[PDB]
Design a protein around this ligand. Structure first.
Ligand SMILES: O=C(O)[C@@H]1CCC[C@H]1c1ccc2cnccc2c1
Length: 164
């Protein structure tokens, strides 16, 4: 039921949209969160998704970390999607503003291949400090399953499409 997306490749689609409003409308099987290793959803996409769940995402995430410990950079976990989706795939891309290695971005996108279809943001972009044009290139060259990318900033969406 995804609508208004521009087809970039056989399996990658993109739209200028707020991933929160997109999730509420579609209720996809999987929404991807741009997580950190501690699942502390303070800002960016994670802060927005968590606020839309009335903090239920953060309560579930704190129980997951108390049991399992932190994720790896490049890793992921599957938790509830709450009121937004059936599942939330929390994926940790490298944070360049914390000095993490951009080379781990391909490993982060490989987590998407475990799900037939996903609603997602660009990993390591925004407050994680990587170049979004690079993040879209790694996405297209790594993900083989059907990915619907929601880009919040209109100016960035136009730059990503015009330079693809
Ligand atoms: O698409 C973007 O412009 C950026 C790229 C990196 C993460 C994206 C982002 C960031 C904050 C968001 C806040 N609310 C809703 C969706 C949000 C999406």
């Amino acid at each position: 039921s995804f609508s208004g997306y521009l087809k970039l490749t056989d399996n990658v689609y993109i739209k200028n949209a707020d991933i929160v409003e997109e999730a509420k409308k579609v209720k996809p099987t999987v929404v991807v969160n741009a997580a950190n290793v501690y699942l502390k959803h303070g800002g960016g996409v994670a802060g927005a998704l968590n606020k839309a769940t009335n903090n239920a995402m953060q309560v579930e995430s704190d129980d997951y970390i108390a049991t399992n410990g932190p994720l790896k950079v490049g890793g992921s976990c599957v938790l509830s999607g709450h009121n937004l989706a059936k599942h939330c795939l929390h994926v940790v891309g490298p944070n360049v503003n914390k000095g993490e290695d951009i080379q781990l971005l391909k490993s982060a996108y490989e987590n998407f291949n475990q799900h037939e279809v996903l609603l997602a943001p660009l990993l390591s972009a925004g407050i994680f400090g990587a170049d979004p044009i690079h993040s879209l290139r790694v996405c297209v060259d790594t993900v083989r399953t059907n990915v619907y990318l929601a880009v919040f900033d209109k100016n960035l969406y136009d730059k990503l499409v015009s330079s693809f």
